[PDB]
């Protein structure tokens, strides 16, 4: 299940940084 956790993270961590990216 750790693969949730981390999965989970990175959705946090690339969200934030491929929102720059949308524009």
Known sequence: GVVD???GAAK???GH???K???
């Open 5 to 7: 956790i981390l999965k």
């Open 12 to 14: 946090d961590i690339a």
């Open 17 to 19: 940084l491929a929102s």
């Open 21 to 23: 990216v949308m524009n």
